[PDB]
Write a protein that binds this ligand. Structure first.
Ligand SMILES: Nc1ncnc2c1ncn2[C@@H]1O[C@H](COP(=O)(O)OP(=O)(O)O)[C@@H](O)[C@H]1O
Ligand SMILES: [Mg+2]
Length: 450
């Protein structure tokens, strides 16, 4: 029987879940690959559902605060480069270069590079021992961290600070919570107004902060909504806004992850946003491309990709929002890709002309989104009204290179805007291109042989 330990505090939301404190010991009914486990506390003896991502086996590597598992080099750098982190802030992760190996990622400063992250491979020997340098070996990652927490001994710096972890969202609000009562939601702060409804910050069952989108009655069939919502429910990625729950009865409420920095469009035309440098803008582009590459892998289609439907979190985290919904709009104009509410400036010609919405028409939309990113959120086709856009683009008009956009990114936009959808790049390629946009001759890792 496995004893689990709580990685974070969890506050009870229902009559059937179990509250616990970080460090609390728990046992479960079944080690399912589900999001919620039936548990009891070895501390309190209380019984209830717990979020499975809030625990790890006791004395597991996953139980360590500094162990971040399958995080990429890029995402580790995002966390480590936070300006609140002292020099020597660190985490350990799986290598993405070498199977079964690990990586020590440490925040450093030198006048040569300023704030930077050093990456050290931790080789695991087939014989079982761990090392960065073959001359200093350890029976465990715990002993390796304990050691370099005292002496740098070749490292850029001593391990001072465990990289802070933002407390993770649960997968779903509660076990089998999906179609929820309207009265379980409180709408607190109006965040904004779209063409088809409003979005509120609010609470589920009193205490869980969520975003709530309220659709005007007549917007979409509750029947069609629930069928699509079952597809949307299956989409799970770090760069997609989670769909939590629905109120199926009109007026339809859509409950999603609250993103505290708002839309990318407003962010770009804001205080932090309007002074962002190209490398920051390319990193945001690469995050959006990764979310859409997941959409692509899942054989799904966004249908409304634009800066307004990217939401921003801490550390310039960008997530894709409002995927799939556009198909369900009943409005006759919108359905005909016509009228004041249709985003013609983001729409591939074959989608606008024939209603052929595919991942390739989302690639077109991504190219337009790149113009928003490189012009601080300027409206595409600035000198044109919506009623004249499709005519121009079908005749082969394309936006020129924005004034502060490098030609290479404009060339990428032009590939996204190929007349033939099958000639447009994949999101897989767009993500690989944008992630490797800037080249360095710098060592990928710090060589272990010193
Ligand atoms: N999940 C969310 N978290 C936080 N704010 C959100 C979220 N979804 C939407 N918003 C806010 O609500 C506004 C309106 O969204 P929406 O109704 O989808 O309209 P549009 O996509 O046309 O801008 C967004 O600009 C943003 O400010
Ligand atoms: Mg939106």
């Amino acid at each position: 029987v496995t004893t689990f330990v709580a990685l974070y505090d969890y506050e009870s939301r229902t009559e059937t879940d179990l509250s616990f404190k970080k460090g609390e010991r728990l046992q479960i009914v079944n080690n399912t690959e589900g999001d919620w486990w039936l548990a009891h506390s070895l501390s309190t003896g209380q019984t209830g559902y717990i979020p499975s991502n809030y625990v790890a086996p006791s004395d597991s590597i996953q139980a360590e605060e500094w162990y971040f598992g399958k995080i990429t080099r890029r995402e580790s750098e995002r966390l480590l480069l936070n300006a609140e982190n002292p020099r020597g802030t660190f985490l350990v992760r799986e290598s993405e270069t070498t199977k079964g190996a690990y990586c020590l990622s440490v925040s450093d400063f030198d006048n040569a590079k300023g704030l930077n992250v050093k990456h050290y491979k931790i080789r695991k020997l087939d014989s079982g021992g761990f090392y960065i340098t073959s001359r200093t070996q350890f029976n465990s990652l715990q002993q390796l961290v304990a050691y370099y927490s005292k002496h740098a001994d070749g490292l850029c710096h001593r391990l001072t600070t465990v990289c802070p972890t933002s407390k993770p969202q649960t997968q779903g609000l509660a076990k089998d919570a999906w179609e929820i009562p309207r009265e379980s939601l409180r709408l607190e702060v109006k965040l904004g107004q779209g063409c088809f409804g409003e979005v509120w910050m609010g609470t589920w069952n009193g205490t869980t902060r969520v975003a709530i989108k309220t659709l005007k009655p007549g917007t979409m069939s509750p029947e069609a909504f629930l069928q699509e919502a079952q597809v949307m429910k299956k989409l799970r990625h770090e760069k997609l806004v989670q769909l939590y729950a629905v109120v199926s009865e009109e007026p339809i409420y859509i409950v999603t992850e609250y993103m505290n920095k708002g839309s990318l469009l407003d962010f770009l035309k804001g205080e932090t946003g309007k002074y962002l440098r190209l490398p920051q803008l390319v990193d945001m582009s690469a995050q959006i491309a990764s979310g859409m590459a997941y959409v692509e892998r899942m054989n799904y289609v966004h249908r409304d990709l634009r800066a307004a439907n990217i939401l921003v979190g801490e550390n310039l985290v960008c997530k894709v929002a409002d995927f799939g919904l556009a198909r369900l709009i009943e409005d006759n104009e919108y359905t005909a890709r016509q009228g004041a509410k249709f985003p013609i400036k983001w729409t591939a010609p074959e989608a606008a002309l024939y209603g052929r919405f595919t991942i390739k028409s989302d690639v077109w939309s991504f190219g337009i989104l790149l113009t928003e990113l490189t012009t601080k959120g300027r409206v595409p086709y600035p000198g044109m009204v919506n009623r004249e856009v499709l005519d121009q683009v079908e005749r082969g008009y394309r936006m020129p290179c924005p004034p502060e956009c490098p030609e290479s990114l404009h060339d990428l936009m032009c590939q996204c805007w190929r007349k033939e959808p099958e000639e447009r790049p994949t999101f897989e390629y767009l993500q690989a291109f944008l992630e490797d946009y800037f080249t360095s001759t710098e060592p990928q890792y710090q060589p272990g042989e010193n």
